[PDB]
């Protein structure tokens, strides 16, 4: 049975979202690639380079016009006529628009594609812009986080393959399943927050007992993600469990919402 074609493109990025994807524990990224989708274009993993790679791109988007999913990591810069991100000698934004035009739907992976992320933080030297401000005529599912949780990425993929539909989304385009509740609404340190039991300085007696990180700047109270329930790296930890407050990394503009160590 043929597998759904997927085209994965990369704008301005750090590659954290690809790296997250390959961390998936269930299903393994191996089994996603071999059995669930046809990952037909992806610069970070594909054998072909240069003209050979671009022949794949052109062939896939033409052969599967209207039928492929476009995954986008990173974002397009509008500055310098788009030439802060050059793809086959031309602005990345041109490749993005070509790929978008044939896609049935778009997955905006990570805070970069969703919102802008670090390159969009003040003063945004490149005019990095999220996908939904450039592509305005296609379904876009935002999957924010820097990067999103590996098993959240793969769960969204399996949902779409199994159910043959896009996940239901909130008013911002984020899947309700994983982004419907705040980190702080499912945080195992909430008992301490409610009791006024706070870490006041690093490695103090409170920190050694796992007290709440609100006074150390935890942004969990304003952040929507699954970290406090699904956790990271096959359930091993999440930021707060390892003793650092949430940075707010799934939220639009989190880099510019004050110091990470200033209280919400």
Partner 1 sequence: STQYETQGYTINNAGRRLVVDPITRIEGHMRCEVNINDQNVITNAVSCGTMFRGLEIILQGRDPRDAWAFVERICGVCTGVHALASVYAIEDAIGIKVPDNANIIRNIMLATLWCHDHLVHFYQLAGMDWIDVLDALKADPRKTSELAQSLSSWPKSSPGYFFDVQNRLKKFVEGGQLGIFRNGYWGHPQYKLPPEANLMGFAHYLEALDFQREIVKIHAVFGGKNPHPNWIVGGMPCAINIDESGAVGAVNMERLNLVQSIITRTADFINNVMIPDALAIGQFNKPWSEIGTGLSDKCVLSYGAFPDIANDFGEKSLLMPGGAVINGDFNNVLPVDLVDPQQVQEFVDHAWYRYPNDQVGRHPFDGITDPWYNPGDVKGSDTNIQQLNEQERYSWIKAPRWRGNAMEVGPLARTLIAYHKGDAATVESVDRMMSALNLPLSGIQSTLGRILCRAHEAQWAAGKLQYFFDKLMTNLKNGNLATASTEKWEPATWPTECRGVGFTEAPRGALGHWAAIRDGKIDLYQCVVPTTWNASPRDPKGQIGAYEAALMNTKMAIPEQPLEILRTLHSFDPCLACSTH
Q: For residue 234, with 0-12 CB atoms within 10 Å meaning exposed, 13-18 middle and 19 or more buried, which class applies?
A: exposed
129 binds, among Cl ion, its own copies, partner 1, none (CB under 5 to 8 A by kind): none
Residue 222, interface with its own copies (CB under 8 A)? Answer: no
Show the CA angle centred on residue 71, arms to residues 66 and 74, nearest 5°.
135
Contact yes or no for 57/41 (Cβ under 8 A): yes
Residues numbered 74-133 forming contacts with Cl ion, rule: CB under 5 A: 115-117
Q: How many CA atoms lie within 13 A of 67 on its CB side?
A: 12
14 binds, among ligand SF3, Cl ion, its own copies, none (CB under 5 to 8 A by kind): ligand SF3
116 binds, among ligand F3S, Cl ion, partner 1, none (CB under 5 to 8 A by kind): Cl ion
| Residues 232-251: x where in contact with ligand F3S by CB under 6 A, - otherwise, as a string | ------xxx-----xx-xx-
176 binds, among ligand F3S, ligand SF4, its own copies, none (CB under 5 to 8 A by kind): none
Q: Token pair of 212, please?
A: 């709440």
List beta partners, residue 226: none
Rule CB under 8 A: choose which of 13, 114, 142, 193 binds partner 1. 13
Alpha-carbon gap, residue 18 to 23, rounded angstroms: 9
Residues numbered 136-195 forming contacts with ligand F3S, rule: CB under 6 A: 145, 183
Residues numbered 174-213 forming contacts with partner 1, rule: CB under 8 A: 176-178, 180-181, 186, 189, 201-203, 207-211
Q: Is 16 annotated as a binding residue?
A: no
| Residues 73-112: x where in contact with partner 1 by CB under 8 A, - otherwise, as a string | -------xxxxxxxxxxxx---------------------
Contact yes or no for 225/183 (Cβ under 8 A): yes
Alpha-carbon gap, residue 39 to 32, rounded angstroms: 9
Binding residues for partner 1, how many (CB under 8 A)? 117
Residue 216, interface with ligand F3S (CB under 6 A)? Answer: no
Rule CB under 8 A: choose which of 3, 98, 138, 186 binds its own copies. 186
Q: Is 246 annotated as a binding residue?
A: yes
According to the 3-state scheme, what is the secondary structure of 152-169? HHHHHHHHHHHHCCCCCE
List beta partners, residue 140: 106
Contact yes or no for 127/135 (Cβ under 8 A): no
Question: What count of other Cβ atoms lies within 10 Å of the Cβ of residue 252?
Answer: 17
Q: Which part of the chain contacts partner 1 (CB under 8 A), choosing from 97-105, 118-126, 134-142?
A: 118-126
Q: For residue 253, with 0-12 CB atoms within 10 Å meaning exposed, 13-18 middle and 19 or more buried, which class applies?
A: middle
Handedness of CA 122, 240, 142, 175 (dihedral sign): negative
Q: Is 112 annotated as a binding residue?
A: yes
The contact set with its own copies (CB under 8 A) reads 181, 184-192, 194, 209-210, 228-229, 231, 234-236
Binding-site positions for [3Fe-4S] cluster = 227, 246, 249
Binding-site positions = 14, 17, 112, 146, 184, 187, 212, 218, 227, 246, 249
């Amino acid at each position: 049975k043929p597998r759904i074609p997927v085209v994965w493109i990369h704008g301005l990025e750090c590659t954290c979202c690809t790296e997250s994807f390959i961390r998936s524990a269930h299903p393994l990224a191996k089994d996603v690639i071999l059995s669930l989708i046809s990952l037909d274009y992806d610069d970070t993993l594909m054998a072909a380079a240069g003209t050979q790679a671009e022949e794949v791109f052109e062939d896939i988007i033409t052969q599967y016009n209207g039928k492929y999913i476009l995954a986008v990591e990173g974002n397009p810069p509008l500055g310098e006529q788009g030439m802060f991100c050059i793809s086959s000698g031309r602005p990345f934004i041109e490749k993005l628009k070509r790929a978008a035009a044939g896609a049935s739907a778009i997955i905006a992976w990570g805070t970069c594609a969703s919102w802008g992320c670090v390159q969009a933080a003040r003063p945004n030297p490149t005019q990095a812009t999220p996908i939904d401000k450039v592509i305005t005529d296609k379904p876009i599912i935002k999957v924010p986080g820097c990067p999103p949780i590996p098993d959240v990425m793969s769960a969204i993929i399996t949902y779409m393959v199994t159910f043959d539909r896009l996940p239901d989304v909130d008013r911002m385009g984020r899947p309700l399943m994983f982004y419907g509740q705040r980190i702080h609404d499912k945080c195992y340190r909430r008992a301490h927050f409610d009791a006024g039991e706070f870490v006041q300085s690093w490695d103090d007696d409170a920190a050694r007992k796992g007290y709440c990180l609100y006074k150390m700047g935890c942004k969990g109270p304003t952040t929507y993600n699954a970290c406090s329930s699904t956790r990271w790296n096959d359930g091993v930890s999440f930021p707060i469990q390892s003793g650092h407050g949430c940075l707010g990394c799934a939220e639009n503009g989190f880099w510019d919402r004050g110091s990470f160590y200033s209280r919400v």
